[PDB]
Design a protein around this motif. Structure first.
Motif, mmCIF file in Angstrom:
data_model
loop_
_atom_site.group_PDB
_atom_site.id
_atom_site.type_symbol
_atom_site.label_atom_id
_atom_site.label_comp_id
_atom_site.label_asym_id
_atom_site.label_seq_id
_atom_site.Cartn_x
_atom_site.Cartn_y
_atom_site.Cartn_z
ATOM 1 N N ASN A 68 0.827 -1.203 0.000
ATOM 2 C CA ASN A 68 0.000 0.000 0.000
ATOM 3 C C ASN A 68 0.866 1.260 0.000
ATOM 4 O O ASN A 68 0.626 2.214 0.742
ATOM 5 C CB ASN A 68 -0.969 -0.005 1.184
ATOM 6 C CG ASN A 68 -1.990 -1.123 1.099
ATOM 7 O OD1 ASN A 68 -1.862 -2.031 0.288
ATOM 8 N ND2 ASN A 68 -3.013 -1.058 1.941
ATOM 9 N N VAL A 69 1.893 1.250 -0.845
ATOM 10 C CA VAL A 69 2.782 2.392 -0.987
ATOM 11 C C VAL A 69 2.555 3.140 -2.296
ATOM 12 O O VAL A 69 3.361 4.019 -2.639
ATOM 13 C CB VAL A 69 4.259 1.964 -0.853
ATOM 14 C CG1 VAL A 69 5.142 3.127 -0.426
ATOM 15 C CG2 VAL A 69 4.366 0.853 0.154
ATOM 16 N N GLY A 70 1.495 2.827 -3.035
ATOM 17 C CA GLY A 70 1.156 3.588 -4.219
ATOM 18 C C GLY A 70 1.276 2.788 -5.495
ATOM 19 O O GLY A 70 1.256 3.350 -6.594
ATOM 20 N N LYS A 71 1.457 1.472 -5.358
ATOM 21 C CA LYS A 71 1.678 0.616 -6.555
ATOM 22 C C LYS A 71 0.489 0.728 -7.510
ATOM 23 O O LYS A 71 0.657 1.329 -8.588
ATOM 24 C CB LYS A 71 1.887 -0.842 -6.136
ATOM 25 C CG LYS A 71 3.198 -1.138 -5.422
ATOM 26 C CD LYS A 71 3.356 -2.597 -5.053
ATOM 27 C CE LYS A 71 4.762 -2.952 -4.616
ATOM 28 N NZ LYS A 71 5.749 -2.698 -5.691
ATOM 29 N N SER A 72 -0.666 0.180 -7.125
ATOM 30 C CA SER A 72 -1.812 0.158 -8.023
ATOM 31 C C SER A 72 -2.180 1.558 -8.496
ATOM 32 O O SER A 72 -2.623 1.729 -9.639
ATOM 33 C CB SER A 72 -3.001 -0.507 -7.330
ATOM 34 O OG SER A 72 -4.122 -0.580 -8.192
ATOM 35 N N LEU A 73 -1.996 2.568 -7.639
ATOM 36 C CA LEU A 73 -2.268 3.941 -8.049
ATOM 37 C C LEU A 73 -1.397 4.340 -9.231
ATOM 38 O O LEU A 73 -1.901 4.851 -10.237
ATOM 39 C CB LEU A 73 -2.056 4.897 -6.873
ATOM 40 C CG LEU A 73 -2.489 6.360 -7.031
ATOM 41 C CD1 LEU A 73 -2.900 6.943 -5.690
ATOM 42 C CD2 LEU A 73 -1.391 7.218 -7.649
ATOM 43 N N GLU A 75 -4.433 -9.095 -8.425
ATOM 44 C CA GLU A 75 -4.673 -8.751 -6.998
ATOM 45 C C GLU A 75 -5.842 -7.766 -6.889
ATOM 46 O O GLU A 75 -6.486 -7.737 -5.821
ATOM 47 C CB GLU A 75 -3.397 -8.160 -6.396
ATOM 48 C CG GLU A 75 -3.278 -8.363 -4.897
ATOM 49 C CD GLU A 75 -1.918 -7.999 -4.330
ATOM 50 O OE1 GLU A 75 -1.068 -7.512 -5.103
ATOM 51 O OE2 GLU A 75 -1.707 -8.209 -3.119
ATOM 52 N N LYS A 132 -3.745 10.192 -3.434
ATOM 53 C CA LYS A 132 -4.508 9.014 -3.045
ATOM 54 C C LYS A 132 -5.995 9.239 -3.284
ATOM 55 O O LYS A 132 -6.725 8.309 -3.646
ATOM 56 C CB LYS A 132 -4.243 8.676 -1.577
ATOM 57 C CG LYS A 132 -2.927 9.218 -1.029
ATOM 58 C CD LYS A 132 -1.721 8.498 -1.609
ATOM 59 C CE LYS A 132 -0.422 9.081 -1.071
ATOM 60 N NZ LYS A 132 -0.281 10.531 -1.382
HETATM 61 N N1 LIG Z 1 -9.599 2.071 -0.934
HETATM 62 C C1 LIG Z 1 -8.817 3.093 -0.601
HETATM 63 N N2 LIG Z 1 -9.294 4.028 0.255
HETATM 64 C C2 LIG Z 1 -8.503 5.055 0.587
HETATM 65 N N3 LIG Z 1 -7.262 5.323 0.192
HETATM 66 C C3 LIG Z 1 -6.814 4.383 -0.657
HETATM 67 C C4 LIG Z 1 -7.509 3.271 -1.091
HETATM 68 N N4 LIG Z 1 -6.730 2.524 -1.963
HETATM 69 C C5 LIG Z 1 -5.604 3.187 -2.040
HETATM 70 N N5 LIG Z 1 -5.586 4.322 -1.271
HETATM 71 C C6 LIG Z 1 -4.491 5.274 -1.138
HETATM 72 O O1 LIG Z 1 -3.775 5.307 -2.353
HETATM 73 C C7 LIG Z 1 -2.461 4.721 -2.168
HETATM 74 C C8 LIG Z 1 -2.106 3.886 -3.373
HETATM 75 O O2 LIG Z 1 -2.735 2.585 -3.267
HETATM 76 P P1 LIG Z 1 -2.742 1.677 -4.588
HETATM 77 O O3 LIG Z 1 -1.471 1.899 -5.335
HETATM 78 O O4 LIG Z 1 -4.035 1.863 -5.312
HETATM 79 O O5 LIG Z 1 -2.689 0.196 -3.977
HETATM 80 P P2 LIG Z 1 -1.420 -0.755 -3.759
HETATM 81 O O6 LIG Z 1 -0.421 0.000 -2.949
HETATM 82 O O7 LIG Z 1 -1.017 -1.328 -5.075
HETATM 83 O O8 LIG Z 1 -2.033 -1.943 -2.877
HETATM 84 P P3 LIG Z 1 -1.435 -3.364 -2.386
HETATM 85 O O9 LIG Z 1 -2.575 -3.910 -1.563
HETATM 86 O O10 LIG Z 1 -0.299 -2.966 -1.481
HETATM 87 S S1 LIG Z 1 -0.920 -4.451 -3.917
HETATM 88 C C9 LIG Z 1 -2.557 3.979 -0.831
HETATM 89 O O11 LIG Z 1 -1.283 3.823 -0.218
HETATM 90 C C10 LIG Z 1 -3.483 4.914 -0.051
HETATM 91 O O12 LIG Z 1 -2.811 6.061 0.420
#
Ligand SMILES: Nc1ncnc2c1ncn2[C@@H]1O[C@H](COP(=O)(O)OP(=O)(O)OP(O)(O)=S)[C@@H](O)[C@H]1O
Ligand SMILES: Nc1ncnc2c1ncn2[C@@H]1O[C@H](COP(=O)(O)OP(=O)(O)OP(O)(O)=S)[C@@H](O)[C@H]1O
Ligand SMILES: [Mg+2]
Ligand SMILES: [Mg+2]
Lengths: 432, 432, 159
Positions: free
Chosen positions: A200-205, A227, A423
């Motif tokens: 949850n460090v910004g990957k999917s974002l 995922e 985010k």
């Molecule tokens: N459902 C959500 N509600 C609120 N903030 C979110 C949410 N999803 C993501 N974020 C924020 O956006 C950032 C980027 O998350 P993403 O890149 O979308 O997910 P990710 O880091 O790939 O997830 P995993 O579970 O680690 S593979 C997060 O670290 C949060 O700060």
């Protein structure tokens, strides 16, 4: 014009150079043309060179066939004479004839299969397969590539090489200038690039943001996330593109009316490609599955992507190694190799994210050795980037981007650079 | 084909040193062919040189025969041109014809002795050997071949190997004094040589440098790469040869005028070989495909490589093993062995680059055990070079190349050698 | 499966709604099935509603023809039932069958075109498409399948 085909194969080097592979004996005749092509191809595979007319006669003497076709081939080789033509029209004629004859052969066999299927059960034979053969043979006749390559001679192929050097084609630029300038040309087609952020460090974002960026550039994007569900990522893309919110998608603070209006106002812009998101169960997706997906996309949905995205490649399956026969390292490296091979085979830009070991979790700096699963994957990877989020950095609504694996140039040119990650809006932007 | 062999003996000086000795009058024919061979053989005997066509008709008119035979020989001497067909094809066809005629005359001998066997002893001729003398003759009938399949004969062919030791034997200069010094003759044909190095250290640059040297030496170079190629290593060859730094190529510093001038200038040089760069998918280029690639290169193009290069290695996906080997021992060693065997079969210089394990990714010195690939790979090797780049070496823009698996020479008193590796021009600059 | 297909078209509503345009008169049969589905499409077009058995019986009664197939068409509409089967299985089988029929039709048309080609050019019906039209229908033969709707597109799937 089969005589012309043979003559231009024999006396012209470039002609044979163009299309040898799509030359097969069943493209010519049931008589002399087929026999002489068979002789020629036997020479081809026996001596690996162009036969001379004298060589043709020599092979002709050491023949097995009887007199009539012997004399026919003798006349044909006598008929074998060079004529002046162009490097272009001959290609068009030879291909036209190839397609025509392939279709003729396919339809001939179709009639045979149909006739056999029409006969009563006693009268018919197992020699000719059932009607099931009708569809497969038809697609075959239509799957001939008519196009082949041999390699890039450094001296002989400098024209198109300089054309590329000035053009810088096949390197698709980003929508953010910092990435383009650190890559110097954008992103190459047969390339695989990975991001390391953590949990949850910004990957999917970042993944969805870049997907939207490339989609805005009139590009066919493929965002295969395992995922993350397609609908979730669809919502993330809604947040990035429509630029409304993520917290407003739920507890809707926006009307369906205005959402639809901005959707239509984006639909009018021709400067936008097609992106479809697909999801599969963890460790249940393989390169063969992806290839079949591409095949059916082109067949039914007439879609061919170019910036194919895989979320956390590490939860695919190699399709070669048996089920978890080893640790993470081997299968991870193998999957990296397979997907990069597919990407270069389809010249589709490949992106993914890799996990980071718990040792580098909550650390201000991440190294290459901080990779979680494998080290062969860093070797297979091109242009890895590390995204770091700190309590201060998160409070700044930003992340630090560092180069750990460079391919397009020096890594130390601009090591540290920040992204204004939102985010709330699912979009990172340059700080300039 | 008798006219063909006669014309090649008359005209092709190259086709006189390969097989003159295996020419016999009874090989040719009962007709004017043997008469012409007798004439030319007599000319060779009296003068140790190839008689010309005028010298041929001079011998014909000089020697007295029947009017029918005079006219027959007159027609044969009137049918001889250069016609430069394939050397290998020529020699193989001649071998086949010689074997055919050997069997033909053996059949004549056995049938005539069998016919002479049944008649009473008074009708027997003392000249003919008994029926028990068939096998050795048949043996010497089937003993007819051109290659020395017996192999080397120590103490008997010592002249030939002495000539080999004198000057340089079968080998290729490295175009660099130090490399040739540590090989004492350069690299030998058919030998398997590897240049292991760390990930992104000196590998591709070294491959390109060696390819450029061998091309400048006029050799035929074939660069098969599993990495990005046909445009990437191609640019590196541009940098090494055209002396144009890659950044300048990317930025379009060249105006395509000096580029064209340099390209055509190197085209003017007769000391330049042929280089074909081919890129293949990761994990799908076996040694069998490699041989087919060689065949296609020799077919479409007038190209037979003298040197062949491999990138990363272990990507051949050898068909000998269906599944990935646990430590890749069997697969990697099989790939290495197949590479060496193919090089032997082609008598060609084969180069590649091995991988270094994570244990020596940052070690200032790399041991032989520091091999990411299999341990059996550093046993089929013939010349294992290893380069290391450190922060000091990067500051000096040099490396600390170390020799291992020194089959050519001794692996001592030369391992402490350094090269001015040019990161901008993709070349090695040994200090003078 | 023409029995099942016609029964579910008459009885099942989501069956009709799912793929109605994916139904051609030539998909069914050269005989009474074609006539009955012709009545089906006629009632669908005249009335934007699902006909009852009585409605199609009335349609066949008024829109009649020669009695030789009148018996066939009248007896054919005597078996359609509710038959609550699987919808997914139904659509899969129907797609398979329709692909079979499309292959049959493209094949037979190519046969006719080649047969006319295998004839003196003077003695050829100019109305028939020529040999150059043979390949494309092949594509038209393969470009016939049900929409799996695999994956989600961010743009056109906003609805
Ligand atoms: N459902 C959500 N509600 C609120 N903030 C979110 C949410 N999803 C993501 N974020 C924020 O956006 C950032 C980027 O998350 P993403 O890149 O979308 O997910 P990710 O880091 O790939 O997830 P995993 O579970 O680690 S593979 C997060 O670290 C949060 O700060
Ligand atoms: N155009 C270039 N400009 C500057 N340095 C270069 C250039 N090309 C190659 N190099 C350097 O030469 C080496 C190139 O990488 P190699 O040593 O060939 O490893 P590699 O083959 O890329 O490794 P993997 O494991 O396959 S990613 C590195 O030390 C680079 O810094
Ligand atoms: Mg994610
Ligand atoms: Mg490399």
């Amino acid at each position: 014009m089969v005589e012309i085909i043979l003559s231009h194969l024999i006396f012209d080097q470039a002609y044979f150079s163009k299309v040898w592979p799509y030359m097969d004996s069943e493209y010519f005749e049931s008589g002399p043309a087929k026999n002489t092509f068979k002789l020629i191809k036997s020479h081809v595979n026996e001596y690996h060179s162009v036969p001379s007319i004298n060589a043709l006669n020599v092979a002709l003497e050491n023949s097995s066939f009887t007199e009539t076709e012997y004399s026919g081939v003798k006349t044909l080789i006598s008929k074998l004479a060079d004529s002046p033509e162009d490097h272009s029209w001959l290609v068009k004629e030879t291909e036209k004839y190839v397609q025509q004859r392939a279709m003729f052969n396919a339809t001939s066999k179709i009639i045979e299969i149909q006739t056999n299927a029409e006969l009563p059960p006693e009268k018919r034979n197992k020699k000719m397969p059932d009607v099931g053969a009708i569809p497969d043979i038809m697609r075959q006749a239509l799957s001939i590539s008519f196009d082949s390559y041999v390699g890039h001679d450094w001296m002989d192929d400098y024209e198109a090489r300089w054309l590329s050097y000035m053009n810088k084609a096949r390197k698709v630029p980003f929508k953010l200038r910092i990435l383009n300038k650190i890559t110097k040309g954008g992103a190459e087609t047969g390339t695989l690039n990975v991001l390391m952020a953590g949990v949850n460090v910004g990957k999917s974002l970042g993944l969805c943001s870049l997907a939207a960026d490339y989609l805005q550039l009139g590009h066919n994007v493929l965002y295969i996330s395992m995922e993350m569900a397609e609908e979730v990522c669809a919502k993330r893309i809604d947040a990035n593109m429509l630029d409304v919110s993520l917290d407003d998608i739920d507890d809707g603070h926006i009307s369906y009316a205005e959402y639809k209006g901005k959707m239509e106002k984006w639909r009018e812009k021709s400067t936008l490609g097609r992106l479809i998101v697909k999801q599969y169960p963890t460790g249940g997706a393989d390169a063969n599955t992806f290839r079949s997906l591409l095949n059916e996309l082109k067949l039914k949905k007439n879609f061919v992507p170019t910036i194919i995205i895989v979320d956390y490649l590490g939860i695919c399956k190699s399709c070669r190694i048996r089920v978890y026969s080893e640790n993470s390292y081997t299968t991870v490296k193998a999957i990296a190799e397979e997907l990069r091979a597919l990407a270069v085979e389809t010249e589709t830009v490949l992106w993914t994210a890799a996990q980071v070991g718990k040792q580098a979790w909550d650390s201000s700096d991440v190294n290459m050795s901080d990779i979680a699963e494998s080290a062969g994957l860093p070797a297979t990877a091109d242009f890895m980037l590390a995204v770091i989020e700190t309590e201060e950095l998160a409070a700044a609504e930003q992340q630090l981007i560092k180069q750990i694996k460079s391919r397009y140039g020096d890594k130390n040119k601009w090591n540290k650079f920040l992204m204004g990650v939102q985010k709330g809006n699912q979009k990172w932007v340059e700080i300039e």
